Design an enzyme around this catalytic site. Structure first.
Site, PDB file in Angstrom:
ATOM      1  N   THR A 143      -5.129   0.758  -3.560  1.00  0.00           N
ATOM      2  CA  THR A 143      -5.593   1.894  -4.353  1.00  0.00           C
ATOM      3  C   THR A 143      -5.188   1.772  -5.823  1.00  0.00           C
ATOM      4  OG1 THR A 143      -5.323   3.313  -2.401  1.00  0.00           O
ATOM      5  CG2 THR A 143      -5.646   4.407  -4.529  1.00  0.00           C
ATOM      6  N   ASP A 193       0.840  -1.185   0.000  1.00  0.00           N
ATOM      7  CA  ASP A 193       0.000   0.000   0.000  1.00  0.00           C
ATOM      8  C   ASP A 193       0.882   1.245   0.000  1.00  0.00           C
ATOM      9  OD1 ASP A 193      -2.518   1.253  -0.061  1.00  0.00           O
ATOM     10  OD2 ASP A 193      -2.752   1.243   2.114  1.00  0.00           O
ATOM     11  N   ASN A 248       0.677   7.317   2.470  1.00  0.00           N
ATOM     12  CA  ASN A 248       1.230   6.446   3.501  1.00  0.00           C
ATOM     13  C   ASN A 248       2.706   6.712   3.772  1.00  0.00           C
ATOM     14  OD1 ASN A 248      -1.216   5.168   3.922  1.00  0.00           O
ATOM     15  ND2 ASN A 248      -0.824   3.656   2.314  1.00  0.00           N
ATOM     16  N   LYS A 275       2.153   4.635  -1.179  1.00  0.00           N
ATOM     17  CA  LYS A 275       1.621   5.779  -1.898  1.00  0.00           C
ATOM     18  C   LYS A 275       1.869   7.016  -1.051  1.00  0.00           C
ATOM     19  CE  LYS A 275      -3.027   5.026  -0.038  1.00  0.00           C
ATOM     20  NZ  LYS A 275      -4.479   5.108  -0.379  1.00  0.00           N
ATOM     21  N   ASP A 303       1.104   2.986   7.802  1.00  0.00           N
ATOM     22  CA  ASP A 303      -0.011   2.148   7.393  1.00  0.00           C
ATOM     23  C   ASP A 303       0.329   0.745   6.933  1.00  0.00           C
ATOM     24  OD1 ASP A 303      -2.505   1.218   6.790  1.00  0.00           O
ATOM     25  OD2 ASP A 303      -2.664   2.296   4.893  1.00  0.00           O
TER      26      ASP A 303
END
Ligand SMILES: Nc1ncnc2c1ncn2[C@@H]1O[C@H](COP(=O)(O)OP(=O)(O)NP(=O)(O)O)[C@@H](O)[C@H]1O
Ligand SMILES: [Mg+2]
Length: 277
Positions: A179, A138, A143, A140, A160
């Site tokens: 995402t 995750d 985060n 990005k 995260d």
């Protein structure tokens, strides 16, 4: 594993709300016995076995277990863990410099030097995780947190670990999905996943850092996922006309559909541009 069931309010004073998620809310807190500050992440538990709301025990325990193992300058650390009937409360290391997202939002676009200052810290953080066979899944702008954004070269930490997984067999096959803009082709196609998926995300992040534009972003989620699977992206001259051919090379070696051809974290650190529904 069971966690501390005493009232977290008897040991901590919470304050400002730092962030929010679909099944989680993060708040700044202060431990009473030390006066030290932290980020309290409250995760909503599932009330029944067959429920969509809340996070299953298995997933919360996976995040906690992965968080207890890590200790590095570029990743967040776990202080304690409490829980009660409705939530599990993760007392994490505070990162009060804000999200890289909001930072980038306020600056539009960075120089290759600024970009590489951030990138190198992120790579170091990911190198550490991959060394422990930990896939973040995750990665990005949202985060990635800065410690202090009022400095010429802000230090960062990855946060995260809600989708993080241990990769002990070279690949995991369990429909892990994040995402659309940052997920790699293998995630979009539901193929076995490994450490390689993080490297693709780094590419998207890098592309964003240098141009302020998303490489695969479409008007809808399905379109974006479609662009990702087809590796549908290009270096727009209006955005990259003054970007070095070396920076593009770096991005190009990460945005590769085939996971086995994608650059590894070690490769990226030795790349000429970096190397000192
Ligand atoms: N250690 C931290 N320090 C400061 N802010 C934090 C920290 N951890 C998380 N945040 C903020 O809180 C937001 C949400 O945290 P995060 O851990 O990403 O939960 P989430 O996975 O979105 N939750 P959920 O949607 O319930 O699965 C972030 O995007 C940050 O803005
Ligand atoms: Mg998040």
């Amino acid at each position: 594993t069971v966690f501390r069931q005493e009232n977290v309010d008897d040991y901590y004073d919470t304050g400002e709300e730092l962030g929010s998620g679909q099944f989680a809310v993060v708040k700044k807190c202060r431990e009473k016995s030390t006066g030290l500050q932290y980020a309290a992440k409250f995760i909503k538990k599932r009330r029944t076995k067959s429920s969509r709301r809340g996070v299953s025990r298995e997933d919360i325990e996976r995040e906690v277990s992965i968080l207890k193992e890590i200790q590095h300058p570029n990743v967040i650390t776990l202080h304690e863990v409490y829980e009660n009937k409705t939530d599990v409360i993760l007392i994490l290391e505070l990162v009060a410099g804000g999200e890289l997202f909001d930072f980038l939002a306020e600056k539009e676009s960075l120089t290759e030097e600024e970009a590489t200052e951030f990138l190198k810290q992120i790579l170091n953080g990911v190198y550490y995780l991959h060394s422990l066979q930990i896939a973040h899944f995750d990665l990005k702008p949202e985060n990635i947190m800065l410690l202090d954004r009022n400095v010429p070269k802000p230090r960062i930490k990855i946060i995260d670990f809600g989708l993080a997984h241990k990769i002990d067999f070279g690949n995991e096959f369990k429909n892990i999905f994040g995402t659309p803009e940052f997920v790699a082709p293998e995630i979009v196609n539901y193929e076995p996943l490994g450490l390689e998926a993080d490297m693709w995300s780094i590419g998207v992040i890098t592309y964003i850092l240098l141009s302020g534009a998303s490489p695969f972003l479409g008007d809808t989620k399905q379109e974006t996922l479609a662009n990702v699977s087809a590796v549908n992206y290009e270096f727009e001259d209006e955005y990259f006309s003054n970007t070095s051919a070396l920076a593009k090379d770096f991005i190009r070696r990460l945005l590769v559909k085939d996971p086995k051809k994608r650059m590894t974290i070690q490769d990226s650190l030795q790349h000429p541009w970096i190397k000192p529904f």
